[PDB]
Amino acid sequence: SMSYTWTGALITPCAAEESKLPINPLSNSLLRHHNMVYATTSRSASLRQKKVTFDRLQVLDDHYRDVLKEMKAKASTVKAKLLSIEEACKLTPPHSAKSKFGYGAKDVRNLSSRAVNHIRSVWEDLLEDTETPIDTTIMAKSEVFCVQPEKGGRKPARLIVFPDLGVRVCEKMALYDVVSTLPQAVMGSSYGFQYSPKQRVEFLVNTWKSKKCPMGFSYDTRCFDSTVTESDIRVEESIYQCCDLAPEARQAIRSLTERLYIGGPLTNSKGQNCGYRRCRASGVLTTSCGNTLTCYLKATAACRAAKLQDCTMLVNGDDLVVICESAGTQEDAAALRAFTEAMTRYSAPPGDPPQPEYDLELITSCSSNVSVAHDASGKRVYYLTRDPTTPLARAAWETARHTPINSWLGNIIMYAPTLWARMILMTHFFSILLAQEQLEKALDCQIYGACYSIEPLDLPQIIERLHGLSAFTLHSYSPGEINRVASCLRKLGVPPLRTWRHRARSVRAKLLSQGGRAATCGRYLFNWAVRTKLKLTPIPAASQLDLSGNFVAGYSGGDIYHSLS
Numbered sequence: 295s296m297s298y299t300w301t302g303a304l305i306t307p308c309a310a311e312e313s314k315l316p317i318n319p320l321s322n323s324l325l326r327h328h329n330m331v332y333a334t335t336s337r338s339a340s341l342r343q344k345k346v347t348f349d350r351l352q353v354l355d356d357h358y359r360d361v362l363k364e365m366k367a368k369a370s371t372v373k374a375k376l377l378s379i380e381e382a383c384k385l386t387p388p389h390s391a392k393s394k395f396g397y398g399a400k401d402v403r404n405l406s407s408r409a410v411n412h413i414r415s416v417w418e419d420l421l422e423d424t425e426t427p428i429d430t431t432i433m434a435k436s437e438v439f440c441v442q443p444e445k446g447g448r449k450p451a452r453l454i455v456f457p458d459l460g461v462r463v464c465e466k467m468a469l470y471d472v473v474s475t476l477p478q479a480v481m482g483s484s485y486g487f488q489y490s491p492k493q494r495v496e497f498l499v500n501t502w503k504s505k506k507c508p509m510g511f512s513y514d515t516r517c518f519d520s521t522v523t524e525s526d527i528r529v530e531e532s533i534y535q536c537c538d539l540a541p542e543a544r545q546a547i548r549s550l551t552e553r554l555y556i557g558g559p560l561t562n563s564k565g566q567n568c569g570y571r572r573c574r575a576s577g578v579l580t581t582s583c584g585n586t587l588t589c590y591l592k593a594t595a596a597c598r599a600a601k602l603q604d605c606t607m608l609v610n611g612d613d614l615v616v617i618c619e620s621a622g623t624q625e626d627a628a629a630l631r632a633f634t635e636a637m638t639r640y641s642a643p644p645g646d647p648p649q650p651e652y653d654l655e656l657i658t659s660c661s662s663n664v665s666v667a668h669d670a671s672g673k674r675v676y677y678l679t680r681d682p683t684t685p686l687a688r689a690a691w692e693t694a695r696h697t698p699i700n701s702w703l704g705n706i707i708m709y710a711p712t713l714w715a716r717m718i719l720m721t722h723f724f725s726i727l728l729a730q731e732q733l734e735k736a737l738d739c740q741i742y743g744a745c746y747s748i749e750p751l752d753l754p755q756i757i758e759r760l761h762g763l764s765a766f767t768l769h770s771y772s773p774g775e776i777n778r779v780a781s782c783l784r785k786l787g788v789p790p791l792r793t794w795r796h797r798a799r800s801v802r803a804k805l806l807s808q809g810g811r812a813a814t815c816g817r818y819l820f821n822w823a824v825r826t827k828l829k830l831t832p833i834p835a836a837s838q839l840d841l842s843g844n845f846v847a848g849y850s851g852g853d854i855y856h857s858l859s
């Protein structure tokens with residue numbers, strides 16, 4: 295059983311694609327070694343196809359089956375609603391890809407009769423037809439990176455695979471409530487996406503302290519999406535089907551699974567057949583939910599197979615953290631070998647073999663880690679940080695070129711307490727946004743895979759919700775964190791942190807000189823910048839402001855939209 299089959303027709307672009315950065319004063323202002331920064335393109339898709347195309351040998355044992363039955367019994371608890379066409383339409387991102395059938399996301403949100411009548415038609419088809427493979431498009435994705443310390447080798451583009459806009463809206467009607475509700479119900483504490491960054495570090499610490507002699511390790515699968523077998527996707531359906539479901543919801547899930555999720559034909563931008571998928575599609579609604587469940591299940595079973603004791607995992611799609619009781623240095627390494635041997639039998643080998651860790655801080659997952667800092671009162675605070683290379687590289691791209699998804703905004707929101715996000719990112723973009731009249735224009739960003747639409751001037755509020763107000767006061771970051779940040783500036787050619795401090799003094803002055811929510815941006819975001827730091831107090835409409843069901847689940851490649859909060 296092969297993950298993909300190719301006819302030889304190319305993965306084709308729809309427009310021109312820029313690779314290298316353009317040299318302009320504003321990006322220079324941030325980053326100097328321009329030629330360290332690249333965007334991916336169609337040209338490398340070939341390469342990506344090679345990494346992602348293989349055969350899958352799966353062998354399931356009793357541990358796996360036991361864990362499934364356990365997961366399923368929890369899933370039996372769920373009652374999931376069928377969404378209305380309207381409800382589902384309003385979950386569609388305004389810039390989601392337009393349909394083959396003469397209407398785009400705008401029309402769907404407007405509930406254009408062409409759109410809703412097509413969607414109704416696509417819905418009925420899921421009820422009438424139970425086997426005909428549903429068309430998907432395959433595209434090379436445009437993502438920006440910094441090149442490897444390994445000379446001049448670049449990641450090839452990733453491949454997105456997604457059904458037409460009308461299918462996608464149906465997917466929401468059928469499966470949205472499921473995909474939002476079930477993972478927590480089945481996986482409890484282990485379900486990553488139920489956690490704000492603050493809550494995620496909380497859970498990791500409390501877990502780490504709850505052990506007598508702790509021992510954590512990160513796991514990650516070489517192309518998880520290709521390792522997802524047809525069987526995996528039907529197992530995953532069997533979990534979903536344990537929900538109380540509307541009859542048409544049950545069939546829709548039944549049809550989507552056979553027709554779309556287990557695989558199907560791949561069409562390119564030009565309309566020709568590239569071939570066939572027998573693994574997970576990156577761009578369906580159930581991708582993140584599927585990946586997480588599948589990973590949780592395979593992982594959980596692999597512990598019991600390697601007799602690790604008191605495992606507590608955190609799962610975010612493909613990304614797996616595990617913290618457990620240690621059996622001694624030499625044992626641990628041997629058990630972790632066996633974990634991997636199990637996962638591999640379940641068709642999920644790792645990129646790089648897990649290595650046991652005896653400090654929580656050295657464990658990295660979802661590209662991020664726990665680091666330590668202190669607040670005003672000097673009492674020691676835990677927060678979530680990241681190697682700033684890729685964030686800064688993208689910040690330099692989105693400065694010198696208009697991007698659909700403003701990644702820098704996402705990172706400030708998410709990594710608000712971190713060193714580099716405050717001193718470099720915040721300063722750089724509030725500088726730009728002030729020069730060009732544009733603090734109030736709402737910008738599109740991406741949190742946990744869902745598209746959000748946020749105004750810069752609501753950042754003190756938002757940051758306070760997620761990380762608390764202490765995220766405006768942290769000051770004594772760990773040596774290793776400062777060492778890592780500093781070495782990253784040297785790599786990309788970013789002016790050392792000293793430099794941003796005055797760029798930021800100027801910068802808190804511009805904002806106080808303007809009142810309103812603009813001023814409390816200056817005051818709160820840049821209290822690290824003045825040497826005569828004033829005190830900070832819980833902002834008014836700044837949590838009890840706007841609330842919702844935001845950070846309750848992930849929708850990576852799931853086409854989900856929240857202007858929420």
Ligand SMILES: O=c1ccn([C@@H]2O[C@H](COP(=O)(O)OP(=O)(O)OP(=O)(O)O)[C@@H](O)[C@H]2O)c(=O)[nH]1
Pocket residue numbers: 435452453454455514515516517518519575576577581585611612613850851
């Ligand atoms: O548009 C896309 C396409 C794909 N993906 C997702 O990226 C993965 C492809 O890449 P990998 O799964 O091999 O790398 P990864 O571990 O870094 O993936 P993430 O956890 O960072 O997501 C797949 O698991 C796919 O679902 C997106 O998030 N967006």
Ligand SMILES: [Mn+2]
Pocket residue numbers: 514515516517518612
């Ligand atoms: Mn992976």
Ligand SMILES: [Mn+2]
Pocket residue numbers: 514515612613660
């Ligand atoms: Mn991953």
